[PDB]
Amino acid sequence: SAKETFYITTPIYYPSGNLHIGHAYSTVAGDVIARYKRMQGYDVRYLTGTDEHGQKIQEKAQKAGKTEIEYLDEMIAGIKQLWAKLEISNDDFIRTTEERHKHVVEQVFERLLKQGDIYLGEYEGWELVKEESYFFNISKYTDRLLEFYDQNPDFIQPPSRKNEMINNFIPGLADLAVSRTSFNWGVHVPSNPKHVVYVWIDALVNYISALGYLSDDESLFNKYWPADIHLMAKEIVRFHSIIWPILLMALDLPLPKKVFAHGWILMKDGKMSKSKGNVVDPNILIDRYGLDATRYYLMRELPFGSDGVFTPEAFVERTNFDLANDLGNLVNRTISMVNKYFDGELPAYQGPLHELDEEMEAMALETVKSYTESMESLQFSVALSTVWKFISRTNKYIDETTPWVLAKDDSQKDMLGNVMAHLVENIRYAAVLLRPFLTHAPKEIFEQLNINNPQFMEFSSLEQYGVLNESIMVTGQPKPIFP
């Protein structure tokens, strides 16, 4: 029967330079939710893309030996290579230079023009800037926007960022300057060609133009709109929670269910900034330490709901202590003992024979429950720390049971077998819960454990502890799961 749809977007990034781990956080965060939602059985569409118009791109191609589009084709090639390297599961990549997007920018602008929502005037702002500009009279939608906030109190996440937008910006909404005559690289206004559509309407409509809105084929739009989550950093929350819902109202379209804004990755001299220069290249981190380590650090160290500071030391600690030592060596210790004592034949689960087992089994279920809650509220660092509490417990379980003492007594084979059974089932739980986060390690762990039944790699298989009630042969050549 038809799966419920879940549409998740990242912001479209500005290719005026190389992307850094700030951009990678948003795209990996989106990828984790997408993979998670697919595992829950949703019909997922995950969109990312590039904002390719503006004076900046013009300058960056002019201050180089190329046309805007040959420059942009180069940068986007590099961005798609990065997402490919990060194993981002985006279902589409929207570019604002492609016809499906530009068509929507022209028609949306002309529609608001014809409705009278956009009118011609002059912008006067701050050096002194003064030029003819089309204005979007958003002020008129103020009352309707506050009613939407009243009916959708969970619209902005986390809730901190909401009361700010309302307290600070909504004073009164001033008419938004939505066009300029001062540059030419962008979508020109059909009814006034010397006008070029500014960032607001151009960038925001990517979420709907990518679903074929106002085209011959609107089937993706009717299927996936409205968006379940727009992801972003805090600096553009007001554009997505004020300008975007008002634009959607003016076009008489359903509004998005949720905007999730995370915090900034900091690097000593403030926010990691493409422009500033204080930049960490995800490619260098993936090349040196591998994909799982780079994905894990991004999602674990930098909590959704606050800012995070990157240090090379903290990266090395997360990689070496959490991944290699805590998880990597739990599996190597377990497989080594199954080989040494049972010659690779893992005895079948029976029940909680040990007195530690009953509450540890209960801990396995309470980990899954705690994980689910954290993931639904987008608390990734808490979801992962909860998983690692369980991994740490599993390591402790080896110490508490002392399997090598049980191996001496020939009458303690039932209990030794039961200890090995609980070790592997604990590892299975951890492997399944990490599938949205780590693309390589879970696969490798199932491989070396010789778990081939694909049902046992899915969330539904965590409902009842002890699914392996058949003898299984684990690898006789265990190797490091990481890097």
Ligand X SMILES: Nc1ncnc2c1ncn2[C@@H]1O[C@H](COP(=O)(O)OP(=O)(O)OP(=O)(O)O)[C@@H](O)[C@H]1O
Ligand Y SMILES: NC1Cc2ccccc2C1
DSSP character for 279? -
Show the site string, 11-50: x = touches ligand Y by CB under 6 A, - = not. Answer: ---x------------------------------------
Q: Which is nearer to ligand Y, 96 or 294 (CB)?
A: 96
- Nearest distance in Å: CB 273, ligand X: 4
Binder among 215, 273, 377, 395 for ligand X (CB under 6 A): 273
Beta strands 472-473; 345-346: pairing state: antiparallel
Which letter, b or e, does each residue of 272-288 get, where b requires 16 or more Cβ atoms within 10 Å of its Cβ? bbbeeebbbebbebbee
Q: Which residues contact 475 (CB under 8 A, 6 or more apart)?
A: 335, 344, 447, 448, 449, 450
Does 236 sit near ligand X (CB under 6 A)? yes
Three-state SS for 230?
strand
Q: Which is nearer to ligand Y, 56 or 413 (CB)?
A: 56
Does 380 sit near ligand X (CB under 6 A)? no
**Cα-based distances in Å from 44 to 4, 30, 368, 460:** 9, 11, 22, 18
- Candidates 177, 197, 176, 171; CA nearest to 186 is 197
Q: Is 274 annotated as a binding residue?
A: yes
Three-state SS for 469?
coil
Q: Which is nearer to ligand X, 242 or 272 (CB)?
A: 272
8 binds, among ligand X, ligand Y, none (CB under 5 to 8 A by kind): none
Q: Cα(352)–Cα(444) distance, rounded to whole angstroms?
A: 27
Show the site string, 14-53: x = touches ligand X by CB under 6 A, - = not. Answer: x-------xx-xx---------------------------
Does 199 sit near ligand Y (CB under 6 A)? yes
Q: Are 173 and 140 in contact (CB under 8 A)?
A: no
| Tokens (6 digits) for 471 | 């003898």
Region binding ligand Y by CB under 6 A among candidate stretches 194-202, 208-216, 306-314, 428-436: 194-202
Q: In which region does residue 290 sit, left (phi positive, over 0), alpha (psi from -120 to 50) or beta (all else)?
A: left
Size of interface with ligand Y, in residues (CB under 6 A): 9
- Nearest distance in Å: CB 198, ligand X: 15
Binder among 31, 68, 117, 202 for ligand Y (CB under 6 A): 202
233 binds, among ligand X, ligand Y, none (CB under 5 to 8 A by kind): ligand X
54 binds, among ligand Y, ligand X, none (CB under 5 to 8 A by kind): ligand Y
C-alpha dihedral sign at 462, 463, 465, 468: negative
Show the site string, 250-269: x = touches ligand X by CB under 6 A, - = not. Answer: --------------xx----
- Nearest distance in Å: CB 33, ligand X: 14
238 binds, among ligand Y, ligand X, none (CB under 5 to 8 A by kind): none
Binder among 13, 36, 224, 304 for ligand X (CB under 6 A): 13
**Cα-based distances in Å from 125 to 122, 130, 163:** 10, 7, 27
Show the site string, 157-186: x = touches ligand Y by CB under 6 A, - = not. Answer: -----------------------------x
**Cα-based distances in Å from 56 to 68, 95, 118, 364:** 10, 16, 25, 52
Region binding ligand Y by CB under 6 A among candidate stretches 2-10, 196-204, 277-285, 411-419: 196-204
198 binds, among ligand Y, ligand X, none (CB under 5 to 8 A by kind): ligand Y
Q: Which is nearer to ligand X, 233 or 391 (CB)?
A: 233
Q: Which is nearer to ligand X, 190 or 277 (CB)?
A: 277
- Nearest distance in Å: CB 16, ligand X: 6
Q: Which is nearer to ligand Y, 30 or 54 (CB)?
A: 54
Q: Which amino acid is at 411?
A: S
Q: Which is nearer to ligand X, 43 or 59 (CB)?
A: 59
Q: Which residues contact 389 (CB under 8 A, 6 or more apart)?
A: 367
Q: Which residues contact 38 (CB under 8 A, 6 or more apart)?
A: 44, 89
Q: Cα(205)–Cα(208) distance, rounded to whole angstroms?
A: 5
- Candidates 168, 179, 173; CA nearest to 243 is 173
Binder among 233, 364, 424, 472 for ligand X (CB under 6 A): 233
- Nearest distance in Å: CB 50, ligand X: 8
Question: Rounded to a whole number, what is the largest CA-CA distance in the chain?
Answer: 91
Q: Are 312 and 281 in contact (CB under 8 A)?
A: no
Q: Are 289 and 432 in contact (CB under 8 A)?
A: no
What residues numbered 50-109 form the site for ligand Y, per CB under 6 A?
Answer: 51, 53-54
Give the bridge partners for 309, in sequence order: 266
Name the binding residues for ATP.
Answer: 274
Name the binding residues.
Answer: 274
Interacting residues toward ligand X by CB under 6 A: 11, 13-14, 22-23, 25-26, 232-233, 236, 264-265, 271-275
Interacting residues toward ligand Y by CB under 6 A: 14, 51, 53-54, 186, 198-199, 202-203
